[PDB]
Ligand binder design. Structure first.
Ligand code: O5T
Ligand code: ZN
Length: 257
């Protein structure tokens, strides 16, 4: 039983998941004076098929938009990778108020939310289940979301939430290309890290975009109005779901720019 409350939250996760104190934990604070530019990093290349969009689900602590992952219709390539990675999900993290909510921070600056677009290594592994615990198994793009003007690209996502208000509800979510949510520039930082919540596997190559995307105060309010309880129980809004940043433990954050 993990969550984001005071008793089951990030600071207690290590009791059930000792890897929470590991050497490749995420998120991290990116100190830009300590990043190392790497001339070998190629540009990020995403090519997603909107027909792979499948379902939106309320998972209690968050909501997920999942994608069909039976073939290479929707892939991420380039950057630090020599393998192609298959899209399987995107989701967001947010905080209790606008002042925080992102997971990664840049030079100590906290943003209001963060988008995660997750992929698994289909060149090397046969399924997400096999890839999920492998050091080279997962690739996640993180986009920092800065509070400001309403972001119209979020519209379909936001409009879908009324059908998945409570824990366990799910609905079709089709014909959507999440590359439309990415910033204009794909300049990025990369470092070896982990899932940011249990099971916290140290299996993620992180791709953190330099450019933020916008989100309005009211759009964030829609996230926070999702309910963590099951239908019929007392309503418990999903106020936050961002993990604090974790020690780099000697890792190097590389920059593509
Ligand atoms: N971008 S991220 O915030 O680091 C991120 C991306 C993907 C997954 C998670 N963590 C969870 O889903 N934890 C709950 C278990 N749900 C089942 C399950 C699904 C996928 C994977 Br892989 C492992 C796994 O056990 C975090
Ligand atoms: Zn995430």
């Amino acid at each position: 039983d993990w969550g984001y409350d005071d008793k089951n939250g990030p600071e207690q996760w290590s009791k059930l998941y000792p890897i929470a104190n590991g050497n490749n934990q995420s998120p991290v604070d990116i100190k830009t004076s300590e990043t190392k530019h790497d001339t070998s990093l190629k540009p990020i290349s995403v090519s997603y098929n909107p027909a792979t969009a499948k379902e939106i689900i309320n998972v209690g602590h968050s909501f997920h938009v999942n994608f069909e992952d039976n073939d290479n219709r929707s892939v991420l390539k380039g950057g630090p990778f020599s393998d192609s990675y298959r899209l399987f999900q995107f989701h967001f993290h947010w905080g209790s108020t606008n002042e925080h909510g992102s997971e990664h921070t840049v030079d100590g600056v906290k943003y209001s939310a963060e988008l995660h677009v997750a992929h698994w290594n289909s060149a090397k592994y046969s399924s997400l289940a096999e890839a999920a615990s492998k050091a080279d198994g997962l690739a996640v793009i993180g986009v920092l979301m800065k509070v400001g003007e309403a972001n119209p690209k979020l519209q379909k996502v936001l409009d879908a939430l009324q059908a998945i208000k409570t824990k366990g509800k799910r609905a079709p979510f089709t014909n959507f290309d999440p590359s439309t949510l990415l910033p204009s520039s794909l300049d990025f930082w990369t470092y070896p890290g982990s899932l940011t919540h249990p099971p916290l596997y140290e299996s993620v190559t992180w791709i953190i975009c330099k450019e933020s995307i916008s989100v309005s105060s009211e759009q964030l309010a829609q996230f926070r109005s999702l309910l963590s309880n099951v239908e019929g129980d007392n309503a418990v809004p999903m106020q936050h779901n961002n993990r604090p940043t974790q020690p780099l433990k000697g890792r190097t954050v590389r920059a593509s720019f």
